[PDB]
Design a protein around this ligand. Structure first.
Ligand SMILES: C[C@H](O)[C@H](O)[C@@H](O)[C@@H](O)C=O
Ligand SMILES: C[C@H](O)[C@H](O)[C@@H](O)[C@@H](O)C=O
Ligand SMILES: C[C@H](O)[C@H](O)[C@@H](O)[C@@H](O)C=O
Ligand SMILES: C[C@H](O)[C@H](O)[C@@H](O)[C@@H](O)C=O
Ligand SMILES: [Mn+2]
Ligand SMILES: [Mn+2]
Ligand SMILES: [Mn+2]
Ligand SMILES: [Mn+2]
Ligand SMILES: [Mn+2]
Ligand SMILES: [Mn+2]
Ligand SMILES: [Mn+2]
Ligand SMILES: [Mn+2]
Lengths: 428, 419, 421, 421
């Protein structure tokens, strides 16, 4: 199937082919003068993939309000149809990340739809940070770390079910992010809550297939506003080290305290073999969940610099799961995910241009200026031509968003799906 | 009428009266040794009021979920009923802040219910940060500063309607907080957006009664995650100054950048006569909206220290509007508001204890250690006895939350209200 | 006696009546709450915190230093001044030394301490500044420097610190370094940390059987882009890697904005790697201000975690307590006195928490009453308890007022020549 | 010429070929985008930023200072090194002086500047440290000190800075003071500000008709609790109160974590009080790192506001641009060279933004395309433009490469005695 007509894609590509050939050739000549083979770079970029969040193709909101657009997806099936568009145009998001119970449905159908749309399934995501209809025990005061045994058992069961769904659809990991924490000093005993959490996670670990991974995701705050059980990478490391070989840490960019050196955390986790994966997005204030690289592109580049460095030195058993975790409140969710996936490949491609030998030399000589300039030479490079050519050669669009708007997809699905209504957030 | 049975109040007060007498007399003797008449302090404390937010009486939530408790208020009237309890027990929250359209209802009935419950109404709160049913233009991309004139006009009209409702119930002010801002660089032109906002606010100011005040509330971020039109007190000052004498700035404690010295902002606004009022709450990370003083009680004291100093310096015509703006996500909203109102009176009382003459002397002599110790001598003082006696003398409860739970009020409204 | 005993007695007697009234009033109030004030006073009078030799002299910033009068000339003057703090507060019996700043004949240092009634806490190494005759500069690092010879030099300095500490009665070595980078790319994060670990392993080998090696994390300064030992996570990795004798030291002002520090303390305790504390306060960065002068509640919450550990029955839990502050606009002696007092204050209030009631509220998820239970302790003015603890142990009811009445500062100002160049 | 002309020419010819290729390639791409590269280049070669005299020497922190070789001592050595930056970049024709650090016979300074081809930007007063023989200490403040005589002394000092500046070609005085408090209660926020305003009014009276008075806000350091001129809000009140000749100076690293600085820039421009900038980068506090070395996009976004201000033809808009950095681990000259380069880079890129398209996407609320319009400009590698601009104006294609090829550092190292061999 092709959510976007092939003629429109070919049409929009031909319209930009000339300019692209020029830019690509100019960049290739420049890279050559730098001892770099543009073709080698493009080949790797075509092979870089990042999972899209099923809950990301829908318009998001804040605790104050939600302003849905037209053609909002009704459920997992409409969401998969929209994710297909993203993959077809960018060719960078072949896999979708499911969230339960939001995307609960017959595993056979999900798999079927995915195969038909040319989409796979990444890590499963459990939900014990909200109450579902008919739920026996509320997660108001926590889940996996709740003081009530029955409540923890219920949370554990839910996570085990997520693993069962994932196995049936082709997933190989479970990501566990909970809101568990406290809003007031004294409300929670830090140590006892963590102990409860560890014990519950141990039960979940027991249900992991031999080739599966369990990712725990830390977050400084929100929904808890005083303390959070899994508040940072330090606690997260203790979790992973304690649970076992299959347990690793997931780093969501906007989940750190102000001014935190996030790329260092990535490096530390790689060093001790616990970098399970990433949740890409950008931010300026808190866990803003904005389009990747829209606020601080250099920081995104620096994270990838650590990723490529580890890749370069053959760090064996190094396959971090890459996923986008964003909320789109003022843009067409599909266009944002498209450009976000693009930005990620942009940062990856620039990281690949880093002269590793020269950098190592300046590091050993303590030539700070040249070391930092060596990274900038790669970062300053406009690799858009490589990103565009990679898409073109793999069946994607030179200009993804332009082709998307030219296709009229949004207007189309807007006519097929029921209207939505604005409203307030959880504030009241 | 009394939401809490008068016999329960008398009972729970008698049960703690002996202990209170002992603590009050001990504190009075200690203060007397420090040259302070405890009676003068209690007299002032029982006169300190802070308005309760109608939107804080029901359980709050986040973008991730809402976990309502039992007996949740069904509307503004249930909310007023619950606010009546807060006032009856603490005697520090005689006024309620309404939010339109959330609390829209016959103004005449609101006033009636208010008078019967012994409650009054503080500043009105406009809402152009969310869309209402049948709304012609969406506020998705802004409201008062939206690029579309028709949208801006609609936002202006809404605020004017808020003023009409407030005039009917006895409100004397309009508080304007909007989410207007951008999530991406370039999305908005900082200056043009601000110019649009100023022009729209000028229209609202034009329709403001001459016995009313117009409060603009700054916020660093959320719902906007890259830029916000009214992002800080600097922009807020420019707004108030531009609009006119009736326009002032409202300071919400959790709306500042990390590590910001908020008590200084308060002092600066007072000096330039633009401190319209406060939205009290506490926080640790962002605009957490937690129970006031639950996280950083000293900071609360330091804010009140600037308020009391303003009086001591002789600043005139200074009557800030005091209001609580909190979200109660994991506690009984009534209990949180009760203890929050209490914490605010606590900080106020301690600020009244500061030996101003001594402090002044240490400041002039640059004796930093004794100057800070002078503030600490006041802050370290446990004024709970003064707060409890104040409540007792004015019809409240020695221990509000204890009396509240003894009343079984929550179970009662839980039975009267749906699930 | 640094401070004349008649001065202390006179000042104590002047305030005796008021202390009696306040203490007995507090005692009755606590009794009504089921707490024995005498039991609290008995524990308070035994809570000690080490005073930093480097904080007895006036501090400064990169912009300027404004010395006061009678600045101590060397380590001996500093010990003399520390003796004043201990005599008046009775809460600072031990001094933390810094090498090479306080380098001197161990026997002389020991003798002076004994004569003044002072002991010595953990030693502190210095490889964040260059000393004269140094073969290699620490400009680009020390224990993690790319140059092997530079690292070896840093290792030998730490071993020397241990030798000095052993001779004077110390039982630990605290290691804080500025190692890090100011530009992206300057350092390879993983290799720099590996170099550090290798060097610390060597230092670890020189530790006596009853010693401890404390590593201190810091988010930034002097490094402004990355720091090798940047946070508690990296710190935990260090202690766990080095061995049983290695633990983490938590300096309150070394964390990112809004960090929940008390949780970090709880985590380290759970995994037995909480070596000790560097107490101070701050509002912006590593401000190094007088403990509790900015956020007294936070200080109380850290102690709440320390007391809960004891309540939970954590075994062999003896964290080292030290003050690490810089006094740029006050008399250092007066600030250290009141800071030590704030520390005992927070400790005393933490002892007042009704743990039985708290555990009940935590189990029932009664967040409001749980927090109020903490507040009922924190709101209690324990000054009378601190004052009585001092009176009973030979200290001053009001330390700073007594210090000022003694005229000590004016005395040492006349005895000590201020530096000219 | 500090750098031999044959060296400059040689290093240029070595890179001339590749540059021609890149400049032509960028010119074609820009043409396809409706942009004339020549128009950009013409503006870029005219963009200047003043170099801080206190920036050519190696910097340090409160913990240590690690000087490099050939450290410039005195204003004459410093002007000599600044000349190198100007010769190679052609973007720093003016130097910012700091009194009393750079005190010297005005006529001799003017003479040295003209000989080196350097002018002088805003004068910088210093009342955040004490000079020998000073009558009153600034320990507790200067312009806002509680002591009248101390304020008068500070005021007189600034006036002297204006006299020195008038004699050498300066047209502005920048005032940054450390004035503030480290403890709650220490200062009365309002009285301190009142005193500051009164003193600044006296300085303002000494300003010639064509002079400007810049006040610089700073959140913290040296004051760690409160600072009189803590932010742009207070700064605006100052400028508005003093008069038309008074404006606000924005130092990028003086803001609270996560602050939207470009918005502050826009607000000040709207109200005619954006006096100038102090460029530098940072990640934690006022790190004073090489401009754009940490967050180059933020720098671009600041220049986006600057370029748009001109595009709108705002009145009273003519900001002074200065670099205010500290180089603790690099050759100061090289850092200043590359920092000045980054500033021009951001400027060039902001010049590339399609204002018409941007304005269109803003009106339609097409946030995605709006931000992409900024990115299209930002993602554009303008190095070819910067290099050509330098080549056409007598500068070096690759400034740092040419600097190293000249062996200048080793040269001054042989002429200037270090403290130790
Ligand atoms: C929906 C998803 O579980 C969620 O975004 C988490 O991954 C975490 O980012 C929350 O802050
Ligand atoms: C509900 C109320 O309008 C709201 O809380 C505003 O005042 C502001 O605090 C929001 O962040
Ligand atoms: C002097 C002492 O080594 C130093 O203060 C360290 O302990 C650490 O606090 C530095 O920021
Ligand atoms: C040296 C110069 O006066 C100084 O850097 C000020 O401009 C300010 O940036 C300090 O933090
Ligand atoms: Mn996530
Ligand atoms: Mn998140
Ligand atoms: Mn508010
Ligand atoms: Mn708010
Ligand atoms: Mn320390
Ligand atoms: Mn420190
Ligand atoms: Mn500056
Ligand atoms: Mn600065």
């Amino acid at each position: 199937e092709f959510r976007i007509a092939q003629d429109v894609v070919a049409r929009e590509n031909d319209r930009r082919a000339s300019a692209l050939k020029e830019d690509y050739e100019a960049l290739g000549a420049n890279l050559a003068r730098r001892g770099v083979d543009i073709e080698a770079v493009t080949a790797k970029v075509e092979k870089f993939f990042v999972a899209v969040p099923s809950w990301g193709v829908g318009t998001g909101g804040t605790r104050f309000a939600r302003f849905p657009g037209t053609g909002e997806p009704r459920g997992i099936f409409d969401k998969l149809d929209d994710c297909a568009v993203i993959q077809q145009l960018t060719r960078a998001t072949p896999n979708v990340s499911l969230h339960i119970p939001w995307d609960k449905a017959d595993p056979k159908e999900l798999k079927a739809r995915g195969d038909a749309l040319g989409l796979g399934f990444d890590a499963m995501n459990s939900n014990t940070f909200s109450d579902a209809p008919g739920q026996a025990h509320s997660y108001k005061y926590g889940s996996l770390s709740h003081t009530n045994a029955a409540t923890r058992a219920q949370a554990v069961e839910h996570n085990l079910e997520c693993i069962e769904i994932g196995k049936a659809i082709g997933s190989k990991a479970l990501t566990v992010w909970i809101g568990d924490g406290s809003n007031f000093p004294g409300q929670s005993n830090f140590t006892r809550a963590f102990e409860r959490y560890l014990s519950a996670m141990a039960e979940i670990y027991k249900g992991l297939p031999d080739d599966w991974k369990l990712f725990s995701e830390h977050k400084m705050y929100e929904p808890a506003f005083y303390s959070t059980v899994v508040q940072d990478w330090g606690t997260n490391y203790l979790i992973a080290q304690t649970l076992g070989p299959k347990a690793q840490c997931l780093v969501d960019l906007g989940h750190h305290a102000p001014n935190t050196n996030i790329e260092m955390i990535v490096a530390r986790l790689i060093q001790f073999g616990k970098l399970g994966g990433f949740h890409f997005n950008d931010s300026k204030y808190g866990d803003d969940d904005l389009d990747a690289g829209a606020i601080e592109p250099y920081r995104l580049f620096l994270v990838f610099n650590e990723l490529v460095d580890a890749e370069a030195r053959g760090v064996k058993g190094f396959h971090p799961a890459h996923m986008i975790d964003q909320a789109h409140n003022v843009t067409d969710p599909i266009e944002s995910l498209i450009n976000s996936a693009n930005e990620i490949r942009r940062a990856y491609a620039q990281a690949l241009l880093v002269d590793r030998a020269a950098l190592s030399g300046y590091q050993e000589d303590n030539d700070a200026l040249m070391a930092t300039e060596t990274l900038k030479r790669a970062y300053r490079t406009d690799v858009e031509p490589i990103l565009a050519e990679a898409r073109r050669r793999t069946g994607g669009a030179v200009d993804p968003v332009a082709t998307y708007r030219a296709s009229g997809y949004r207007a189309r699905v807007a006519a097929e799906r029921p209207a939505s209504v604005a409203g307030g957030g959880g504030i009241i």
